[PDB]
């Protein structure tokens, strides 16, 4: 029955596909093709040529139909697309067809599209197709960076699965401060926010990755507030190290903080932390040896700068 029905499916798809192609060669760009492809694209959204067929039909019908009839066809297409996305939200072809459709509409409802994105991101906060679509919509509707920044903040605090949200923040922050390194007041606020994130959940790598970026966004240029904030982070990571002695992210971040503070003064401690970290994260031992070699060479150059 189950294996038998997947022969019944095969033949209907086969016959439907046959029919679409015959009609296409015959120049029959009509609503029967929309009917035939809807029966195939729901189960087989990566069949790119059938999406091409729908666009050719919609383009042709736009020429020989009334504005009111074209408007009805568009609304039907939006609903078909939404139904397809519910079944497979990870198909390149479905998301592209929606972008194609919205880009040519006279009066696109962009607020409705942003709400659709919010909905899909509630279901999968890591869906990159949907994040990409949201950026497309944001550009088209001239949604300002500060608005999108507000969206990321609510997503980051309400639950985990934050890599996609933090990534979006890294792209939006530089737009609020467009320089032909973030400004220090902005950086300090970001350090506070991310520090909350990884002390709340020390296992979520997204916060640690974002933090490393902020540590690179001068040492002998350290203000007293930044110097004091970094020293505080250092002690706070050492506290976490006690609570979670197998947490490799906190150990690496301790090394990076000492580098950001004073490479030569913290040489001894830095080398000690490399030994512990390699024991905790052995698969990365070769990376960690190369990082340490890089740091030892940097230290040699700093020692040679001595007057």
């Amino acid at each position: 029955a189950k294996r038998l029905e997947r022969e019944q499916k095969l033949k209907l798809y086969q016959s439907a596909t046959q029919a679409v192609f015959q009609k296409r060669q015959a120049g029959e760009l009509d609503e029967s093709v929309l009917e035939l492809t809807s029966q195939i694209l729901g189960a087989n959204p990566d069949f790119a040529t059938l999406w091409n067929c729908r666009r050719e039909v919609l383009q042709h019908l736009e020429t020989e139909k009334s504005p009111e009839e074209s408007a009805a066809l568009v609304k039907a297409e939006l609903g078909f697309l939404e139904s397809c996305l519910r079944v497979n939200p990870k198909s390149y072809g479905t998301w592209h067809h929606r972008c194609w459709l919205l880009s040519r509409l006279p009066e696109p409802n962009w607020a409705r599209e942003l709400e659709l994105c919010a909905r899909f991101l509630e279901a999968d906060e890591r869906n990159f197709h949907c994040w990409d679509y949201r950026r497309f919509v944001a550009a088209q509707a001239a949604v300002a960076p500060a608005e999108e920044l507000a969206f990321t903040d609510s997503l980051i605090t309400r639950n985990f699965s934050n890599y996609s949200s933090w990534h979006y923040r890294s792209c939006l922050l530089p737009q609020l401060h467009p320089q032909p390194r973030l400004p220090e007041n902005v950086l300090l606020k970001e350090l506070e926010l991310v520090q909350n994130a990884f002390f709340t959940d020390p296992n979520d790598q997204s916060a640690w990755f974002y933090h490393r970026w902020l540590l690179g966004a001068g040492r002998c240029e350290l203000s007293v507030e930044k110097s004091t904030v970094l020293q505080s982070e250092l002690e706070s990571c050492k506290e976490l190290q006690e609570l979670e002695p197998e947490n490799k992210w906190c150990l690496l971040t301790i090394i990076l903080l000492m580098r950001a503070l004073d490479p030569l003064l913290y040489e001894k401690e830095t080398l000690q932390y490399f030994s512990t970290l390699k024991a905790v994260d052995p698969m990365r031992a070769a990376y960690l040896d190369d990082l340490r070699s890089k740091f030892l060479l940097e230290n040699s150059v700093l020692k040679m700068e001595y007057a």
């Binding site: 095969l10 990159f128 990409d132 979006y168 792209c171 698969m283 990376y287 890089k294």
Partner: protein, 324 residues
């Protein structure tokens, strides 16, 4: 923390004879008839894995060459199958196959070049076809196709570089388009692109290399981005990218080797995305190609840029310098 656990009786030896029988018999059927939209690429995956295993002769060269010729459209682009529409993905696949077979002049090369050239946009990006989807995957398809044909000079290379670099992220990786999140697949495409165009000095190799080696999970398998399950395919994309930037040693090679071997189906042959799953040709190529990069003696050396046997690329003198 998301990972697989490899059971103690998972395959732990390379079943080369079985994989060759699996591919040689493939498409002799539900999934076959349903995947006709990717047939040209399916053919590429099959032929490349056979050639890496020394078994290319068991496939049907003459049948495949006629099929390729019948898939080139009047615009110069190549479709996945007869009557389907042309796309950069299947144009690359076709040119890769013809290179494997030293039969590039079976198609109209001038028209291929014209097709590729036509798909570049003002910002240097490439659309996949006339319908305008922009993806760095297609920048790679464009330059890899042209490199294999000796015609990289046909596109606007500095603009193409500017677009790809505009897709570099806070973590050193690359996504589909500007502002897109880093993903192993797109990192492979962008690092391969920069290798072909001689721009690897613009990658932050230590930073990107760190992001890539953190893809390795305790099972030994690699995921395609943070907090996802491991997969044989992402694993190849990560390994090839690491090799291009001279940092293949940053992952645990023995642990990954064991993960890849565990994905084999010992009854049917083939590799699946993860142990216990159903195999397919796509994951079969990437399993074999990954093992080659890790130095498996029974498999031919594979190019991390083109995912073809190095000996084929040597023959046509297309071997981009890496950061080792």
């Amino acid at each position: 923390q998301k990972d697989v656990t490899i059971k103690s009786d998972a395959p732990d030896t390379l079943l080369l004879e079985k994989h060759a029988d699996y591919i040689a018999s493939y498409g002799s059927d539900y999934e076959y008839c349903m995947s006709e939209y990717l047939r040209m690429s399916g053919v590429y995956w099959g032929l490349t894995v056979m050639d890496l295993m020394g078994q290319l002769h068991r496939m049907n060269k003459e049948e495949i060459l006629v099929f390729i010729k019948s898939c080139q459209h009047e615009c110069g682009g190549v479709s996945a199958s007869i009557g389907h529409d042309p796309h950069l993905l299947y144009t690359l696949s076709a040119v890769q196959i013809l290179t494997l077979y030293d039969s590039i002049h079976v198609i109209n090369v001038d028209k291929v070049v014209a097709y590729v050239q036509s798909l570049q946009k003002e910002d240097g990006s490439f659309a996949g076809d006339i319908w305008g989807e922009i993806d760095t995957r297609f920048s790679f398809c464009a330059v890899a196709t042209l490199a294999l044909l000796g015609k990289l000079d046909a596109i606007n290379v500095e603009k193409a570089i500017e677009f790809v670099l505009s897709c570099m992220n806070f973590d050193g990786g690359f996504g589909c388009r500007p502002g897109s999140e880093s993903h192993a697949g797109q990192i492979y495409c962008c690092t391969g692109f920069l290798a072909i165009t001689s721009q690897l000095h613009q990658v932050n190799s230590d930073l990107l290399g760190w992001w890539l080696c953190e893809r390795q999970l305790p099972s030994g398998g690699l995921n395609g981005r943070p907090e996802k399950l491991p997969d044989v395919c992402y694993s190849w994309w990560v390994l090839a990218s690491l090799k291009i930037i001279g940092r293949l040693h940053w992952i645990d090679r023995e642990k990954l080797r064991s993960f890849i071997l565990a994905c084999q189906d010992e009854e049917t042959g083939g590799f699946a995305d993860r142990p216990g799953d159903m195999v397919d040709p796509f994951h079969t190529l990437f399993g074999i190609a990954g093992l080659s990069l890790l130095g498996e003696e029974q498999i031919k050396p594979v190019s991390p840029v083109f995912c073809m046997p190095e000996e084929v690329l040597q023959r046509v003198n297309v071997q981009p310098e890496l950061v080792s």
